[model samples]
Target chain A: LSASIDISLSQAVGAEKVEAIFPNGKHLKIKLPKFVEDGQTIRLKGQGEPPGDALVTIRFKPHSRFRLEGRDVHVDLPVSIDDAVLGGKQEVETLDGRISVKIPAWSSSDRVLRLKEKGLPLKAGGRGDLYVHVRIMLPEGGDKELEDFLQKR
Target chain B: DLSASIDISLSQAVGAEKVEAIFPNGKLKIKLPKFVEDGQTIRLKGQLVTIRFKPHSRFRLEGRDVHVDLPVSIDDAVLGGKQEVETLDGRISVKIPAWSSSDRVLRLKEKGLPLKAGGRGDLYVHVRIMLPEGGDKELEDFLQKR
Candidate 1:
């Protein structure tokens, strides 16, 4: 939202007052909360000259591993090559925390496994389902077997 | 000036010594090109409800005029010397009275705070006599010998 007169950030945290005009210069004083400091990252309600969101952005680094999730978020379940080829009790992490799911034999890289209703909370209402993408890593790849095959061939 | 009134945080305000607060609204992203800031604005004001400041530990705010305690050394109080003190405008050296007693109120004109009615309010400094925790042997001897 915008305002006339170089206004100081109004303080009363969580306290609302009549009117903050948007950049379009509407004279109608809309109720605004003042608890927000200069970009303490704020959120607002509706009915102004426009509509929008004021989300707080948190940033971080990305590293490939067992967990690459946001704060209180979920991640992909780790699986071994044997686990992928054999396809059995995938006692990795999924749906009901620390439970097992089956990986169809010979699973390839980036195979996403879906779990019903195991996702994060939806902004609108209910929860989202979890999608665990299986990564075919190794107890060390079939390198030695390939070498043996190469010798035979 | 429509006054982009500087609102320094409470813990920092008294000693911030900063003049204009840097444009803090990140979302607006108004790049003023540095040169064009500070003046020339539209006065489309009706009223944005002003948020009251939290009570300060050092400065007692009244309307615009602010009162604060300026601690002075016993020697400084007895022999009237200069001491640096915090003021709304900035920090400045102030002359302490030789015969000054504790709780003596000294007025610094036009240095308190911004007045809505226009102009600034006066600042009041109450000089408090302060003694060091430990005694200076030689200095104590001079007094004790007397």
Candidate 2:
């Protein structure tokens, strides 16, 4: 019936949709074509304390890898230093899946790459954008080859 | 929706490790971090947080509402006094009605748990009067005479 719940953007970033459980140990499946606003009340007819309306208040949990703003998810896209230097198709992870994102030549760190329709679902029937900020990092430990190549310049 | 507290390999938890989560409508490929120690628990998104009543020293939960048992002195219950009582949010000052009894319940709005409809429930304080354990003669005699 009536209950409070946590909605993660990752849960909303799926093919089917969000899943919820009622207080009475009943299961519910919801297909949200777009994202639901935080703190918005979603009413389920005949699902309340009895045959009454069950009002579900949506609350978003802060995700570990994604920061949400108006349905758009933002994440730091860590890139290898070589990838930054060469600029090519790099694999980046999103809430949906791993995607190949192009890092244009001469790309610098902290540049934002936008992936359309990859963010939280929108109430307006579409979806929000996923902003990926580039973060250039060395290839783990020893980058002797890269250092030598750079020294040659 | 069903969830479990499982431990996967740290290598699999390289970053946001993708794992298959069982669901009714379909399967959810949820990504969890490498380590999650320190009183932490995580579930798939869109899941609801639940509430269960636990015994408290002075408070009670009525549906979504909160009921607190406030202790007052027998003398203050007679002459009316101000005392601090515990609410769901915190402690607040409550005025005891003149010649108050032990059954007084004062309702505090929007001080309990968050409701299913997006607002907070109310808090009810049950007043109980207390006397010295050894039975004070001075106040007992004063009340008996008066």
Candidate 3:
């Protein structure tokens, strides 16, 4: 037989008030806005029993995406190619300051590529790919005045 | 995985000599206990404060089951001095008592339960009124009529 555990605030006072006390015993108190009356009831959703009665099949929905595909891990890369060109190894900051690294092109001679622990899942174990894609850029033609100056030269 | 069952018991009771404040002449006050976690319903009870000569002239303190009648008259020395009932849109102010000394004053706008009675519940006041040593006959006659 399998079972699941559910936790809920059973009382109005319990639901209305939440005080977080640190190791020093000073409390960070948060009073929930009055959704229900003093006697009425309210619910905090996504906080009930596990989906199935499989004692250990419990899987939590990902709050954000973190998945790997092939040798490439497609993350929401914030820093552009220009930023990487500027030799700024500083991690990319997202809505919440999440650190991320963008990979640059690898050399053709090197086969033992290193992804520096960037491509692996936070929970699952294993290293990931150091892709070797070449980057190339082309500039636009100069303005007519600049072209004339060059012609005069 | 772990599971645990904890048993808890709660006691609900009202102690002796409960006092509540009231808006003089215009309002009624009531005292209600704190709500329990699983409590689906509640019952409130109280007696009206009255003076000596107007022992029979009753004012209503409406609650779930009981409605207390307080008496008042001109001859009786007002324990608390009379003050003008503030009016908004020609409506006279009614004084209601609270459950305890620390309890906030309940302003009885209209009537009924907090939910069903238009807005929230009626305000209960906390006040002590002094009565004369003996009762008056005229007030007794008034009580008999009602």
Candidate 4:
């Protein structure tokens, strides 16, 4: 908000006038080039009352995000596997893989399945993802190529 | 002589601002600011009368603009109805349903009219929770969790 102060004082000693007092009051006195006379000095008397100052305090507030039903973080998993053959044995094969991860869990209701690169786009926050756990199951008595590839990996 | 009853009836018809006292009834009557006009015909009932007394026009100040109409009605002005009138360029008319306070604001928005100062109209929706027709074990468990 832009504002200014103008004052006109009447007293036993001839009248005093001041105009366009800035916000800071540091630029206390300004001479009006257009209206100033050679002998007069612009006087700014405290118009209404003595100037008193007080402190203004401000506090910070935070925002919250949407949460799911109260629970731990949940994720869906998808797996795909091909038929494979074992050494002299017709048996099903199970491939297991797991990775350790840590996520910011604010509360019990913060269960969220984040898609890849779908988290908050802020300077401090990185992209989030839906942690998927895939369990590949192979059919018994399949081609040796698939079995050899799995064994080598 | 013109009867006093006839004179009073004529004054009532013409909406006379004031009328002289006349005693037609055999009993004495107290003088009060009474509606000389028939109550059924010219009584100002319900809310107070509001008169704009200005030509219907639009006013623009800086980026903020407002369109107003000169309307005189017996009931309270319908909220957001003014915006609807302005957007339709005075082509459409709004009649608030009798005793309908809910869904009134949403109807205004649906009519392509938004309130002044980037504000939105309110909507009151009547929510009725209906259970599924058939019940299963999983559905029962879900209801229990809820």
Candidate 5:
């Protein structure tokens, strides 16, 4: 029988190992390609049952942190009220690693910060941009001093 | 080798609540993970269960984060007072800062649904200032003057 499998976003973008037990009771282990497009098909070349070749169609799995818009990637970035009010340099997590991004002061919610060439690599050339949508986070529980100051002001 | 799909509520997903699912073997009580993603597949023994969420009236699920609209009185928005908010856990007190504008979103950390990796997601509280019922001549007059 033909196989349909899903891979994580990281695995879809980079090389990763996959281990799965086929419905046919066959245990399969394979290394994924460096980059895979959604719905791309790969021929396992005689990995199927009894002289049959396994036709593996790859699908990207749903992720909680990152979302893909075509080739571009998007992520929600949480920011404190103070940081939103007084914008400054902040560290953001990317696929590569953590990088610094400057948040403009008085930035409102739903504000988008674009990082050039920081997203998934393209097939033809170059890479996509990473959209860092800002989410303003208020003080947890409540801020007594800040509240008192606001009350007076 | 067998696959099944399950419907879950926001609360159930957040708490990793237990549920009864009918399988070929028998009725099995399955406790969901602390955090679950829509369309996420859970491997149980040799079976597979895909989780999906039902529509919620007051809460909007964004990945692991939960969004809710918080209605505040004009006085509360201006004077900065404590307001009770309903989250995944229960009713909790959240401060309404003075001069809080409409549509201002307040994020409550670790108050949202759980994540697949670890740690809980944040809850977003959108401030919606509620005006006084009927008409306030003094308030209208003050606004008119301004």
Candidate 6:
């Protein structure tokens, strides 16, 4: 007999702990390993009747802020033109909490900065990396004099 | 049998790009579909391969529909004019309606990712008002006076 589990994106990424509930109202508490893949199977030896294995398949739900590529996580970072151009310290929200990131000078759109060991946990040891994609946000409406300068050009 | 997934660029998915996936057995060559969504699984050459999109900085895909930010200068956005914007396929000119404001979406019919059902999805162009580059003394003076 086999059972499947659908975990939240955070649970999958965090991969800390989980509870597998069976059809008969039985629950199995499990300490999850790092970097669980979709369709992965976890066999509980001697958990089933006649000492059969309790099979648990893992599935990850979609997340709003994070996207996963295997164990690596990707998040879009919107920055002001001043920050992108001048390069400065910017705050980023991650699984670990708020992190102040140093942005390289002249950072352009589509620039990716890698944060080591900040992503999902990996089975082999250590965590995956997180990639921050920098996108430049323009001023709302129009800057008056700046618009005039462009218009005059 | 070897299980694997291939990573391709978003534009490559739209362009039906030809690529090869390396496996222990050998390299499997296949021409991608005209449009492919993320996490799509397919059987090619009797092997299973999942399609994953690389993180794109410019475009976001929802099923077949594609969304992109169109940076329009203040004047072009206000006056409404034809602006050439880059789509997954390439550069295309779209008519920006007069008095377009920020976050205004202009839907272009059948310009998005192609559907397997023999049609294409719509493309949404979000108007983003942008300022001029560099600092101008005149601009500073004008702003200070206001």
lDDT tens readout by residue for model 6, A1-153: 467888875676676778888876668877767668888899989887635778888988777778888889998776655566567798988877789999886665547899998887788878889999876654666555545554664
In lDDT terms, which candidate is top? 6
User: Which segments of model 3 are wrong by more than 4 Å?
Assistant: A1-54, A63-65, A70-73, A80-85, A93-116, A119-153, B1-146
Q: Tens digits of per-residue lDDT for model 3 on A1-153?
A: 222122121221122455433333333333443221222222333222333221211112232433335423333332222222232343543222355444442111111223443442222444343332212111133234322322332
DockQ of each: 0.00, 0.01, 0.00, 0.01, 0.04, 0.11
TM-score of each: 0.34, 0.45, 0.19, 0.15, 0.50, 0.60
Model 4 lDDT at residue B64: 20
Q: What are the per-residue Cα lDDT tens digits for candidate 6 across B1-146?
A: 78678898877887786877777676577899875878988876665888898888789888889899887764575457899988878899999876565547899888887898878898999876554556444534544454
Backbone clash tally (model 4): 0
Write one digit per residue (lDDT tens) for candidate 5, span A29-128.
Answer: 7777665788987778788875787776788888778889987999877765456555778787777678888998656554789888777668776778
Candidate 4 lDDT by residue in tens digits, B16-124: 3343434344211222222222222222332111111122233211122222322311112211122123332234545443222221222334222233344433222
Every candidate's lDDT: 0.47, 0.61, 0.28, 0.26, 0.73, 0.76
Tens-place lDDT per residue, model 2, A43-111, is 889866585887666677877778878778898776654454446788877888888899864344436
Interface Cα RMSD per model, in Å? 41.7, 38.0, 46.6, 26.9, 9.8, 6.2
The candidate with the higher TM-score, 1 or 6, is 6
Off by over 4 Å in 4: A1-153, B1-64, B76-90, B95-146
Q: Candidate 5: DockQ?
A: 0.04
- Give per-candidate clash totals: 4, 6, 24, 0, 0, 0
Location of the lowest summed lDDT over 10 successive residues in candidate 1 chain A: A5-14
Residue B109 error for model 6, in Å? 1.3
Error of 2 at B131 (Å): 77
Native-to-model Cα distance after best TM-score fit, residue A129 in candidate 2, in Å: 1.8
| Model 4 chain A worst lDDT window (10 residues) | A81-90
TM-score: model 5, chain A:
0.80
User: Chain A TM-scores, all candidates?
Assistant: 0.42, 0.80, 0.29, 0.18, 0.80, 0.80
- What's the C-alpha lDDT at position A140 in model 3? 34
Among all candidates shown, the one with the greatest DockQ: 6
